[PDB]
Amino acid sequence: HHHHDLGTENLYFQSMEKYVRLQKIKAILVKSTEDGRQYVIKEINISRMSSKEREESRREVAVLANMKHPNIVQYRESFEENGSLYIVMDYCEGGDLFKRINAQKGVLFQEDQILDWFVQICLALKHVHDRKILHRDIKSQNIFLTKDGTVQLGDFGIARVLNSTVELARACIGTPYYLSPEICENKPYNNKSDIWALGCVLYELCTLKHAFEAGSMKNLVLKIISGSFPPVSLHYSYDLRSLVSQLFKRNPRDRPSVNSILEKGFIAKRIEKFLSPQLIAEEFCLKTFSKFG
Ligand SMILES: [Cl-]
Ligand SMILES: [Cl-]
Ligand SMILES: [Cl-]
Ligand SMILES: [Cl-]
C-alpha cells in the first residue's frame, strides 16, 4: 500500500470443493475433485465492473442463489477470486432443448410430449414471475433435460430489471429469434416480453423451426413487429394452435399471463404429474407476492 489498490480483490467461498475444467460450452463444464460429479460454472468478470454494476450483479446472484424449483436448474454455490465471480450450477445430462429439437430431423413431436415439456417450462416461469423477477433467457438453448427426462429452465438469465437497448444489442450479437415487438421498438422490457419468448419456444417445439426468420437483422425486426409467422400444423389441437396465437399478440398486455396459460384445461390437467399437492397449494393458492413489500 504505497501508491500512485492491493487488498481490493474480492474473495468469497462457501466450501472447500474444487472443480476441474473439462471443456468450454462464458460457461465451462467441470468435474468435482471430490466425487467426479459434473457441474456447469459461469464465469463473470467483476474487477472491471463499476460500483453500480457490482451492486446489481450482487443482487442478481442472491436471487439466483435463493431460487429453488424442481423445473429450474439447481444452483449449487458461487465463489469469487482473481477478479471474477463464478456460479456453480448442476449439469443437466440430457442437454438443451435446441439439440433435442434438431435431433428430430424434421419429425414433428407428439402433442402430448410438447405439452408435458411446455407445462414444466410454464411452472418454472410462474415461479420466477410470481416473485416479480424477469427472465432474459427463455430460449431453447437455455432449457435443459435432466438424466431422468425432467425439463429445467436455466437459472442463469433471471434479472431484477432489464434495459431494452442492452437486450436489443445482446440479441443482434447472440440470438435474435426471441425478440419481442416491444424490444424491437425500444420500449420497456416487461413480464409479457418473457411470454413472447415462451411463445417462441412453444412454436419451436411445434414446428422444429423459429417463428421469425429473415435475411437481415433489420428485416427480422420488421417481421417481428408485424407479428406475421408461418402457421403451426393443423394436425395440432385448436387449444394448442390458439395458445400459440395468443402468445404472439403484438401488444404485451394482450398476451396471457403465465398463470392464465396454466389455468387452461388442456394444460392444467398435466400439472399434477409434476408437482406434489403441497407445492401446488403453495405455488397456486397460498404464497402471495406483490410489488408492495
Ligand atoms: Cl414425440
Ligand atoms: Cl443455469
Ligand atoms: Cl400493451
Ligand atoms: Cl406473466
> In the chain, what are the domain boundaries?
1-91, 92-293
**Cα–Cα distance, 77 to 13 (Å, whole number):** 8
Method: X-ray
In the set 90, 137, 155, 194, the catalytic residue is 137
Neighbouring residues of 252: CB distance < 8 A, sequence distance ≥ 6: 180, 181, 182, 190, 192, 193, 195, 196
φ/ψ bin of 105: left (φ > 0), alpha (ψ from -120 to 50), beta (otherwise): left
**Cα–Cα distance, 170 to 198 (Å, whole number):** 18
Give the Cα-Cα-Cα angle 250, 180, 175 (nearest 5 degrees): 150
Matching residue, cell 403484438 = 250
Question: Which value, in Å, is the radius of gyration of the alpha carbons in the chain?
Answer: 20
Q: Strand pairing of 38-45 and 27-32?
A: antiparallel
CA neighbor of 139 nearest in space, from 101, 86, 166, 187 = 101
- How many Cβ atoms sit within 10 Å of the Cβ of residue 191? 17
Q: Which CATH class is domain 92-293?
A: mainly alpha
What residues form DSSP beta bridges with 20? 31
Q: After which residues is the chain broken (C to N over 2.5 A)?
A: 4, 25
Three cell numbers written together for 166: 442492452
Distance 73 CA to ligand 2 centre (A): 5
Whole-Å CA distances, 207 to 111, 138, 171, 204, 235: 11, 17, 22, 5, 11
Report the run of H or E that residue 130 belongs to, with start and end.
helix 111-130
Of the chain, the end-to-end C-alpha distance in Å amounts to 44
Distance 104 CA to ligand 4 centre (A): 30
Q: Which CATH architecture does the domain made up of 1-91 adopt?
A: 2-Layer Sandwich (3.30)
SS3 71: coil
Contact 20, 88 (CB under 8 A): no
What residues form DSSP beta bridges with 135? 158
Is 273 among the annotated ligand-binding positions?
Answer: no
SS3 206: helix
Distance 226 CA to ligand 3 centre (A): 15
Check for a shared fold between 1-91 and 92-293.
no
**Cα–Cα distance, 134 to 114 (Å, whole number):** 24
87 phi and psi angles, rounded to 5 deg: -115, 125
239 a catalytic residue: no
φ/ψ bin of 106: left (φ > 0), alpha (ψ from -120 to 50), beta (otherwise): left
